[PDB]
Design a protein around this ligand. Structure first.
Ligand SMILES: Cc1cc2nc3c(=O)[nH]c(=O)nc-3n(C[C@H](O)[C@H](O)[C@H](O)COP(=O)(O)OP(=O)(O)OC[C@H]3O[C@@H](n4cnc5c(N)ncnc54)[C@H](O)[C@@H]3O)c2cc1C
Ligand SMILES: [Cl-]
Length: 468
């Protein structure tokens, strides 16, 4: 009984459909893209050409909604990398000492993650993916949405797909601003923090011995330095490859040419480690860039009026600067927020509004973590009324910088910091008295003076082939 229509069959759409199919009789997913029968790139998810980190907070939720996905990913060559034990990270405050595991991440191509997640979701035959289909209009009116009018691309035929609940998960390029205007809703407040960040990515074949058990390697900008923020991330993915993504805010953008890529990874960032490691590896693709890096949020939950039966989640409601790596975990948290309101309110009037509000809460930590560190860069453009980002942003940042500094050399502060940064704990968790006590206790290990690489990791950057 009852039906859902989900707009967009990407990460948020697949997760939300798996959840919804446990609460409604059927789920229909509408997408204008064509979907490959394998782990390939597709036009509807262009961001898949860049490094994607799936933090524990999101990965645990993916596993809860689609049990077995983690093992299927690992069986397909994805890597489970412990945090901080499995990462070599030059932070704004120095090298992170590699304490024992506190959290983790899953490292693989976004194409593989999407394929795996889609396959697992569609094992439920009550979920149907309708490809190559345009979304023309929401059915109903500003008081209640009752489905969607769609158009088949190949035939051109239009039909109405009924729904008790429509969920827009069409991503950063969502047409809901248009769909909701034509439904007769007021325009939502648009909030953004635009550091002008640009990505550049090349794929590499790792040295053969380093195809597994290799760390996540990141060189971070110093958000406190009045200069463009540039980063470099090297991430293992399946089939013995490394995805390397470099990034820079306004005035420090990485170049488009293959030669400038390696120079940026050496000299454009604060430490050349990633540039050093890609010099061991074989490039496989030419530089691809992306400017889809603005933190942008639409406050649908604060509209004066909202239709029954409509919810927007994922990048369609809040999108982030990807350097912090939260988007997929924010969407997963947002799916559980909808599930929470479904369990509390079933389909009574008030469901959609309460879910939209809960989704606003769900994305708030990812939103603050990204925007708090982007607002300071030279030439950052902002449109916000959030006092946390302006008036007393410095005080919020003074505490974050003290936590961030102490986390590099104190295990208890690190454990709390990585719980928050993986979206495994809430923002307030850091004000726990015991955390602030550890912060005041300060460092328990010396600051590393060199990249904290293990001998047995560096040993695997060479084959030893030309040696009798
Ligand atoms: C460069 C870059 C790097 C990133 N790195 C990370 C990372 O490390 N970690 C992380 O967690 N997140 C990362 N993200 C964010 C992540 O990609 C998104 O948060 C995530 O894909 C959001 O999922 P979604 O389902 O909301 O949208 P998407 O996954 O983009 O899916 C949107 C879907 O809607 C469909 N669609 C779009 N428009 C229409 C339309 N008009 N009609 C019908 N269908 C439509 C598309 O075909 C697609 O299937 C990164 C993003 C970028 C750009
Ligand atoms: Cl992109």
């Amino acid at each position: 009984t009852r039906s859902a229509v989900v707009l967009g069959g990407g990460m948020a759409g697949m997760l939300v459909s798996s959840m919804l199919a446990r609460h409604v009789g059927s789920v229909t997913v509408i997408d204008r893209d064509a979907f490959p029968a394998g782990p390939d790139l597709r036009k509807g998810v262009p961001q898949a050409r860049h490094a994607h980190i799936l933090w524990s907070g999101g990965a645990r939720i993916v596993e809860e909604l689609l049990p077995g996905t983690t093992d299927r990913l690992l069986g397909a060559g994805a890597h489970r990398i412990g945090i901080p034990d499995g990462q070599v990270s030059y932070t704004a405050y120095g090298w992170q000492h590699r304490f024992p595991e506190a959290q983790f991440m899953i490292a693989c191509s976004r194409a593989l993650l999407d394929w795996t997640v889609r396959e697992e979701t569609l094992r439920e035959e009550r979920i149907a993916l309708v490809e190559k289909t345009e979304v023309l209009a929401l059915l109903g009116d500003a008081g209640r949405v009752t489905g969607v009018r769609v158009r088949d691309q190949e035939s051109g035929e239009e039909r109405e797909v009924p729904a008790d609940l429509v969920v827009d998960t069409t991503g950063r390029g969502s047409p809901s601003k248009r769909l909701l205007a034509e439904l007769g809703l007021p325009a939502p407040e648009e909030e953004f923090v635009d550091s002008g960040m640009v990505y550049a990515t090349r794929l590499f074949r790792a040295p053969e011995a380093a195809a597994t058990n290799f760390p996540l390697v990141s060189v971070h900008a110093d958000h406190r330095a009045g200069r463009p923020g540039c980063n470099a991330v090297l991430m293992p993915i399946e089939d013995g490859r490394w995805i390397v993504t470099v990034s820079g805010t306004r005035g420090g953008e990485p170049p488009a040419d293959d030669e400038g890529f390696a120079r940026f990874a050496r000299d454009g960032v604060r430490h050349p480690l990633v540039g050093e490691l890609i010099a061991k590896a074989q490039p496989l693709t030419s530089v691809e860039r992306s400017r889809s890096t603005v933190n942008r949020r639409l406050h649908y939950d604060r509209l004066a009026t909202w239709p029954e039966g409509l919810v927007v989640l994922g990048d369609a409601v809040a999108a982030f600067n990807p350097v912090y790596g939260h988007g997929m975990s924010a969407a997963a948290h947002s799916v559980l927020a909808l599930r929470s309101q479904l369990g509390q309110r079933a389909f009574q009037p008030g469901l959609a509004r309460a879910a939209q509000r809960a989704i606003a809460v769900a994305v708030d930590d990812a939103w603050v973590l990204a925007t708090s560190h982007d607002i300071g860069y030279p030439g950052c453009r902002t449109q916000t009324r959030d006092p946390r980002l302006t008036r007393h942003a410095g005080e919020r940042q003074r505490v974050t910088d003290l936590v961030g500094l102490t986390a590099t050399r104190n295990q208890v502060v690190n454990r709390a910091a990585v719980a928050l940064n993986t979206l495994s704990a809430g923002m307030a968790s850091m004000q726990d008295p015991a955390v602030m006590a550890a912060v005041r206790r300060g460092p328990e290990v010396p600051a590393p003076t060199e990249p904290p690489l293990r001998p047995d990791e560096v040993a695997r950057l060479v084959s030893g082939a030309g040696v009798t």
